Design a binder for this molecule. Structure first.
Ligand SMILES: Cc1cc2nc3c(=O)[nH]c(=O)nc-3n(C[C@H](O)[C@H](O)[C@H](O)COP(=O)(O)OP(=O)(O)OC[C@H]3O[C@@H](n4cnc5c(N)ncnc54)[C@H](O)[C@@H]3O)c2cc1C
Ligand code: SF4
Ligand code: SF4
Ligand code: SF4
Ligand code: SF4
Ligand code: SF4
Ligand code: SF4
Ligand code: SF4
Ligand code: SF4
Lengths: 284, 183, 427, 188, 92
């Protein structure tokens, strides 16, 4: 199987360990990850979608055409990038006039959006294309960890369009986490936003850090050993915002933040240096 | 004094019907059939810690209080978590309306400097979060390339991104000046 | 045109229709799928807006039905086939095996006292228990016992203790064939199941109940002897919340209609809780208060003024179970324009009304069309509310759509008149 | 057409609960049909004159009947009728004969003064003129709202305590046409 | 920053039931039966030139938000003109 590999910004530019773990995991699963040469910001929906829909849609459509050139579906492991690309894809596919406008903009770049590929999420690809049994076969180091699963807002919502799992009480990520031997611990307001989406992190850092502080308070009361996410934007929020919360209010949580790919790599006995824990601000 | 003769009453002078018609025509028509149950506000995590009230935003959009909406700082408290939209009993596309209102506000000049900085980063390097030297070293150490195979590595891709930005007028929107490469 | 009628459903609407037809001189059959007649009216403790005892007024009509010379009552039976047309309906009914002889059983209840197997009682709506052999409630008509073979172990103690020899473990389903001229469908409704409303946590949170369960609990003859008790620890709740429009006016679940009665019975049950427990705090979360009927607005004002029941205009966003099993309702007060997170010892969901189980099978058997809400459709929404486009078939009660007792009774009487006209004419 | 000039109004306001749910006039009951016929007439005005703006001032929207909630939603989705949750404080006639409705928008939590070319009062239902004379002639009792009293509120809605005398329709209290027709058939 | 952790949510900590009982026992019994129609606020002349909202004062008194009421400057904007009381459909 072949799939185009979209990287985004935060993963490749702040946390390369997630990227390396994903590459190793997909090599072990016999899935060929094809680089999307010349890919850019998806662009981050929080700022660009809030500023100008046309620009956001055009940049996302160019990113989609990069993969369309290779005739491969796009695979993303960021909830923000998945949301942006998927929304642009299903907006252009189902709207002829908007497609014509975006193609008029794209013309000067020597590209045209055809609506020929699909945008897919990393967890969804793992659950459907691989399956829990083959994920389980590859586990060599069954983990002993109590983890708090942070789904992120844009993995499952808007569910009417994504139709992956129930947004109120989903179980896909919990199952993918538990095939590793770790235990997904229920905690209060589990489906709550981390506070970084919608451009709030850069607009009002205090509000986003309050989101994160509430989530961390709930997670700590449940006893977790770590936070597991499928969004480098949520990953960055938790990691950097724990330090910011300590600096601003002197509150210590010391809850390591792991991407789902990193957890799978840990359960699959990947080399430690491949996880690139040095990138994380919170010591793991 | 508590006196203020304009802030405490709504007349036709505060209403812009063209704003409401524009919002509905641009994909926020569902806001027409909000019956103001308040489920969205109860579900809103930002409404619990800020003066942001999404239900009142929907109501103002329906009424046509443009100046009250676009100039409102609380409009930027929405994280687009979609919690409200999943639970709306009238199936209103709340997040779509919020984003359209934010677009109108940006057109009116209510853009925060940090968001403009993110836009300028995208313009200059194609990445909202461009790579730094430490991450380059980390990438090299772990077997990955020094640069990701993105606009960081391909100047022509960055030129295409800049062409797209120029075509849509995004550079003018955030006041990016190509000559000096500043805002 | 045959001068015999068939009434399907033994609720208040069906009881009224059958009694009206019998008093007009027509031989009537009544078919009821449950062991006893009464419908949902028999499960209520009181009725709004008068707070009068429901059973005290329903039981005489049930007795009248049970002892009427012009009525043949066939309980624990289902209509299997309907063929023919107006005046010429051939109906095949199957009487399910009670394993108890209706002619011999006196409903004394000794077999119940001696039975060793416990099983849920359908009359208690999943919060009350009975034995494998049971009588649904003391005022049942016919007052006869029923054995559920899904739970019977065949220990034969009931046979030993029965003095009338009414126990029949070898009973078989019976086939009945009747000829009628008119049919009145009065099959009522079921309460909406709020399990799918995951945010409110029904079926997960311990102290979240429905309105009908509260009706059974507050009933003096209910499983708790009329005491409102927390399911978690069996103690009285000091704080109770009511949530309106659960399963209604909600496009997220495909229920865009009003259930038309939940506001009133929510207020009634809040008033009853206050009467029994004056120190309890009762709060209602509503979108609109639909007190439209006669004396309903006064009932609402009485709820606020005499009982001090609190009204919050806001559709709750979520119900969160705290570690101690208390429940936090997170909801906007839209009139204060602010989010509130209030704690309660019990939460009651004002569930709506849905068509009953097996409605589609009966609708296809008769051949009727259904309205957009899923209930049976009438010939004309304005001038023929109890008629159907199938000649000789009529609707009465909630079978045609949600409504309260007096509306259902008026519809049943009107259906009796409309069905009698063709039978009086005779051609 | 406007009573003042013979010209079509461009702005129309509807006021709910006029003569109902009001202890200031001794009318503490709901008239049960004004919400629905207000919405119906707003929809009809929109159908005939699509450019007209229609606003309804309501306390509760009592769309309880069959298809009534769908009708309520259709009033907004299809015809674009505006709903303001607020019982108007006053109607002021301006020199040009337009009308300013002064009312709180309770969901915005702010006072509004909106101008309209026509204002329609959602008047309730009362017993007909000469009702007391006929009631005394027959010898029937009346309920607290002034309408005739049924024998039993729950199980005898069309009977009276006077044997051989029956009630049908709004004589027993406000209601819509299908309910009155069902009551008439039951009384028969 | 727009962050404010206490002003934008109501819990049992913001509620003083004894205050509501005291006001009701002292002659404010009728506030128990407000239906929040908003006629009072629409009638209020100080409501359309100041942030004073009489209906919200009645609601807060019913709920028991003592601190929000007693410390509110707008509480002193009422001229006692009695228009709201004259027009209240619930006779509050
Ligand atoms: C919690 C609650 C509280 C309420 N409180 C009040 C109140 O205080 N006052 C008031 O006026 N109204 C009240 N109502 C409404 C009231 O219950 C209904 O208006 C009334 O019960 C309708 O009677 P019915 O005979 O039409 O239907 P039902 O009461 O549902 O009776 C229908 C009958 O048909 C039977 N049946 C179903 N399917 C078949 C079949 N296929 N074959 C044969 N028989 C069948 C049923 O088992 C039942 O015996 C309340 C409702 C609820 C849910
Ligand atoms: S949840 Fe939907 S219907 Fe309710 S107030 Fe919000 S947008 Fe309006
Ligand atoms: S999407 Fe915005 S308005 Fe809706 S719940 Fe999330 S933060 Fe609140
Ligand atoms: S079956 Fe026999 S013992 Fe049981 S109630 Fe009937 S008569 Fe009594
Ligand atoms: S035979 Fe069946 S019904 Fe009778 S006592 Fe035994 S278990 Fe109960
Ligand atoms: S009657 Fe009241 S509670 Fe029931 S659905 Fe209608 S508005 Fe909601
Ligand atoms: S039906 Fe509506 S408008 Fe008429 S009295 Fe009742 S609430 Fe008021
Ligand atoms: S007029 Fe009376 S009922 Fe209406 S909001 Fe004011 S005090 Fe409450
Ligand atoms: S008395 Fe006058 S000033 Fe005071 S709240 Fe009432 S209307 Fe307003």
């Amino acid at each position: 199987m072949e799939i185009a590999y979209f990287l985004g910004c935060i993963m490749n530019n702040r946390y390369p360990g997630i990227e390396k773990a994903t590459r190793v995991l997909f090599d072990k699963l016999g899935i060929e990850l094809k680089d999307m040469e010349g890919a850019s910001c998806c662009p981050a929906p929080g700022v660009f979608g809030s500023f100008d829909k046309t620009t956001w849609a055009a940049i996302a459509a160019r990113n989609i055409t990069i993969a369309e050139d290779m005739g491969a579906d796009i695979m993303t492991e960021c909830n923000g990038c998945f949301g942006s690309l998927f929304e642009t894809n299903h907006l252009l596919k189902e709207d002829e006039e908007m497609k014509a406008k975006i193609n008029e903009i794209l013309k000067e770049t020597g590209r045209e959006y055809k609506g020929e590929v699909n945008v897919r999420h990393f967890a969804e690809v793992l659950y459907n294309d691989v399956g829990l049994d083959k994920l389980s076969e590859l586990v060599e180091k069954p983990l002993n960890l109590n983890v708090a699963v942070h789904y992120g807002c844009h993995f499952l919502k808007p569910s009417d369009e994504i139709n992956i799992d129930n947004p109120e009480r989903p179980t896909i990520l919990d199952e993918i986490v538990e095939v590793t031997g770790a235990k997904s611990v229920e905690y209060k307001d589990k489906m709550m936003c981390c506070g970084a989406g919608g451009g709030v992190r850069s607009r009002d850092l205090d509000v986003a850090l309050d989101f994160t502080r509430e989530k961390l308070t709930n997670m700590k009361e449940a006893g977790v050993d770590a936070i597991v996410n499928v969004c480098p934007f949520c990953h960055l929020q938790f990691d950097v915002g724990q330090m910011e919360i300590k600096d601003k209010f002197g509150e210590e949580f010391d809850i390591p933040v792991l991407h789902l790919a990193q957890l799978l790599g840990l359960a699959m006995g990947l080399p430690k240096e491949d996880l690139v824990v040095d990138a994380h601000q919170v010591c793991v | 004094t508590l006196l203020q003769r304009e802030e405490n009453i709504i007349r036709k002078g505060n209403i812009d019907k063209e704003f409401s018609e524009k919002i509905k025509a641009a994909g926020g028509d569902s806001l027409e059939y909000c019956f103001q149950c308040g489920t969205c506000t109860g579900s809103c995590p930002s409404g619990r810690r800020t003066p942001y009230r999404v239900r009142q935003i929907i109501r103002k959009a329906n009424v046509g209080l443009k100046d009250e909406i676009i100039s409102d700082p609380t409009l930027w408290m929405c994280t687009t978590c979609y919690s409200c939209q999943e639970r709306c009993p009238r199936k209103v596309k709340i997040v779509d309306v919020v984003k359209l209102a934010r677009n109108e506000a940006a057109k009116a000049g209510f853009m925060a400097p940090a968001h403009k900085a993110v836009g300028s980063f995208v313009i200059k390097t194609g990445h909202g979060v461009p790579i730094n030297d430490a991450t380059m070293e980390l990438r090299k150490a772990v077997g990955l390339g020094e640069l990701p195979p993105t606009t960081h590595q391909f100047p022509e891709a960055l030129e295409e991104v800049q062409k797209i930005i120029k075509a849509t007028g995004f550079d003018q929107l955030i006041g990016y000046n190509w000559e000096t490469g500043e805002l | 045109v045959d001068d015999k009628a068939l009434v399907i459903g033994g609720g208040v609407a069906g009881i009224q229709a059958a009694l009206d037809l019998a008093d007009m001189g027509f031989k009537t059959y009544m078919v009821e799928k449950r062991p006893s007649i009464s419908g949902r009216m028999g499960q209520l403790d009181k009725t709004f807006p008068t707070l009068d005892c429901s059973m005290c007024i329903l039981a005489p009509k049930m007795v009248d039905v049970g002892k009427h010379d012009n009525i043949e009552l066939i309980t624990y039976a289902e209509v299997k086939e309907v063929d023919g047309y107006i005046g010429n309906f051939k109906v095949k009914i199957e009487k399910k095996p009670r394993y108890i002889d209706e002619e011999l059983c006196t409903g004394c209840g000794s077999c119940v006292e001696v039975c060793p197997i416990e099983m849920p009682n359908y009359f208690d709506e999943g919060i009350g228990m009975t034995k494998a052999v049971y009588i649904p409630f003391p005022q049942a008509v016919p007052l006869c016992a029923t054995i559920d073979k899904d739970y019977c172990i065949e220990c034969m103690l009931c046979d030993e203790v029965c003095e009338r020899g009414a126990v029949k473990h070898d009973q078989e389903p019976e086939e009945i064939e009747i000829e009628v001229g008119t049919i009145i469908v009065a099959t009522g409704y079921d309460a909406y199941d709020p399990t799918e409303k995951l945010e409110y946590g029904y079926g997960r949170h311990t102290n979240v109940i429905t309105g009908l369960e509260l009706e059974r609990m507050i009933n003096a003859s209910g499983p708790t002897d009329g005491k409102v008790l927390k399911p978690s620890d069996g103690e009285k709740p000091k704080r109770v919340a009511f949530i309106h429009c659960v399963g209604s006016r909600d496009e997220q679940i495909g229920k865009p209609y009003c259930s038309r009665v939940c506001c009133m019975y929510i207020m009634k049950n809040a008033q009853l809780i206050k009467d029994k427990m004056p120190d309890t705090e009762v709060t209602l979360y509503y979108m609109d208060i639909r007190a439209f009927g006669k004396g309903f607005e006064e009932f609402y004002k009485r709820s606020q003024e005499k009982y001090g029941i609190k009204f919050i205009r806001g559709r709750p966003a979520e119900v969160i179970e705290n570690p101690d099993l208390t429940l936090t309702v997170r909801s906007e007060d839209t009139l204060l324009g602010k989010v509130t997170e209030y704690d309660y010892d019990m939460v009651v969901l004002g569930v709506g009304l849905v068509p009953p189980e097996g409605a589609e099978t009966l609708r296809q058997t008769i051949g009727l069309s259904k309205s957009a809400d899923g209930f049976l459709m009438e010939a004309h929404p304005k001038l023929r509310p109890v008629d159907t486009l199938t000649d000789g078939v009529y609707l009465a009660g909630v079978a045609q759509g949600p409504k309260d007792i007096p509306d259902a009774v008026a519809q049943a009487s009107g259906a009796a008149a409309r069905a009698a006209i063709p039978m009086v004419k005779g051609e």
